[PDB]
Amino acid sequence: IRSLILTLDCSEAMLEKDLRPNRHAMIIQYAIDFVHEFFDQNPISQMGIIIMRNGLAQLVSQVSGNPQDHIDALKSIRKQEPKGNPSLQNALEMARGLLLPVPAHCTREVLIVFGSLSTTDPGDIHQTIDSLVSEKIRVKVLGLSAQVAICKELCKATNYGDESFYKILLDETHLKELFNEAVTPXXXXXXXXXXXXXXXXXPTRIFEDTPTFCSCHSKLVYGGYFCPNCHSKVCSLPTVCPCCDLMLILXXXXXXXXXXXXXXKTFAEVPTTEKFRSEDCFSCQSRFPXXXXXXXXXXXXXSRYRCEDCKQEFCVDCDVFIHEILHNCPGCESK
């Protein structure tokens, strides 16, 4: 569904001592964690890692849905020293070369981790910006410390003229938060066009391994997925079958679809003196006063959470928990 291109800054400016021990190692590690979370909340999505080193853009992880390739590609960067200077234009041109074969019904995202305060580009970057906006490519830049006007014009131009995507990071925790923000999709207002895709297989799991089989690598396996079209037994991933080009999805597509469908209804905070109901939680059992800062003014007040779709009481930890995972409110299942 999504096609994100992770462009990490790997130049001499990354050798400075801001993060611990340096910016490069923390960006690599947090990039590995970003690969984990991204492939955990986006199963049938694509990733591609490019680095900006030695004044050039170097593709280190081809566009694929297997996280292990990105993990190894990120492990190879921390064993070398980030030298040279960053090149935004070359990275955006190569990102274009990786996002052009992507179908129009799939989003094209480019996430740039920019630590330096200056880039080294051959040609005019504004023409590359015009090319990015023309072919519809959403660009998000996580810059370090001071702002760059080119990043403002790029993030604003690549998002329907709206500026709210050039995120400034000031610490490791902030960078973690931005990473987390790139996991979640962005249902923007769009420009109203047509959408649909067709042909998505569902596999049958083969447990046989006495003679083994493989139609994508011709190697030994312990069992493999079955294509309902070309009838090939390949390595197991819910992505595209490489023998006739169609998906092999299962309950994962339903999972991410329902995750994108979650309304996440925050329960209204109503004091016990206003609800006139005993302290109760419907997901567990709560006899704990929430408020008690003062004497009888706060202890006898407390806070009861309310789901209005069923008029039920809950405590805060369960509102947070059902906001993180699970469908909202067990009381909405009983009528």
Partner 1 sequence: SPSLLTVIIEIAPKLWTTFDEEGNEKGSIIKVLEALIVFLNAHLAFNSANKVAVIAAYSQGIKYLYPXXXXXXXXXXXXXXXXXXXXXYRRFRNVDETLVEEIYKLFELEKKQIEQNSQRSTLAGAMSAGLTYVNRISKESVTTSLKSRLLVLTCGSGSSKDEIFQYIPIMNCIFSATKMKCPIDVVKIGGSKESTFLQQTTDATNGVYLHVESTEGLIQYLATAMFIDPXXXXXXXXXXXXXXXXXTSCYLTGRVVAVGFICSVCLCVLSIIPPGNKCPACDSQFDEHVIAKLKRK
Partner 2 sequence: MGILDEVWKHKLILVETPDAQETSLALETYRKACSNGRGAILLSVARGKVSEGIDFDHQYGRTVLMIGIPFQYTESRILKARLEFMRENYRIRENDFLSFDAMRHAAQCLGRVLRGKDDYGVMVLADRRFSRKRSQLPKWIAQGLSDADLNLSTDMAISNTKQFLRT
CA pair distance 47, 31, nearest whole angstrom = 12
Vertex 307: Cα angle to 305 and 312 (nearest 5): 80
CB atoms within 10 A of CB 101: 8
Contacting residues toward partner 2, per CB under 8 A: 88, 117-119, 121, 124-125, 145-150, 152, 164, 168, 170
Q: Is 302 left (phi over 0), alpha (psi -120 to 50) or beta?
A: left
User: Closest CB to partner 1 among 165 and 282?
Assistant: 282
Residues written for the chain: 335
Contacting residues toward Zn ion, per CB under 5 A: 227, 229-230, 241, 243-244, 281, 283-284, 286, 307, 309-310, 315, 318, 329, 331-332
> Binds 243, which of partner 2, partner 1, Zn ion, none (CB < 5 to 8 A, cut-off by type)?
Zn ion
- Sequence letter at residue 72: D
Contacting residues toward partner 1, per CB under 8 A: 1, 105, 193-205, 228-229, 246, 249-251, 253-260, 278-279, 282-285, 287, 317-318, 321-322, 325-327, 330-335
User: Closest CB to partner 1 among 131 and 204?
Assistant: 204
Distances from the Cα of 138 to the Cαs of 1, 39, 40, 141, in angstroms? Answer: 14, 19, 22, 10
CB of 191 to partner 2, least distance (A): 25
> Binds 164, which of partner 2, Zn ion, partner 1, none (CB < 5 to 8 A, cut-off by type)?
partner 2
Q: What is the DSSP letter of 266?
A: P
DSSP secondary structure of 106-142: SEEEEEEEE-SS----SS-HHHHHHHHHHTT-EEEEE
Phi, psi of 3 (to 5 degrees): -135, 95
Contact 63, 3 (CB under 8 A): yes
CB of 138 to Zn ion, least distance (A): 22
> Binds 230, which of Zn ion, partner 1, partner 2, none (CB < 5 to 8 A, cut-off by type)?
Zn ion
> Binds 149, which of partner 1, Zn ion, partner 2, none (CB < 5 to 8 A, cut-off by type)?
partner 2
For residue 55, give the nearest of 90, 81, 28 by alpha carbon.
Answer: 90
CB of 1 to Zn ion, least distance (A): 14
Encoded tokens for 38: 């991204």
CA pair distance 153, 161, nearest whole angstrom = 9
> Binds 322, which of partner 1, Zn ion, partner 2, none (CB < 5 to 8 A, cut-off by type)?
partner 1
User: Closest CB to partner 1 among 189 and 194?
Assistant: 194
> Binds 14, which of partner 2, Zn ion, partner 1, none (CB < 5 to 8 A, cut-off by type)?
none
CB of 226 to Zn ion, least distance (A): 9
> Binds 309, which of Zn ion, partner 2, partner 1, none (CB < 5 to 8 A, cut-off by type)?
Zn ion
CB of 25 to partner 2, least distance (A): 21
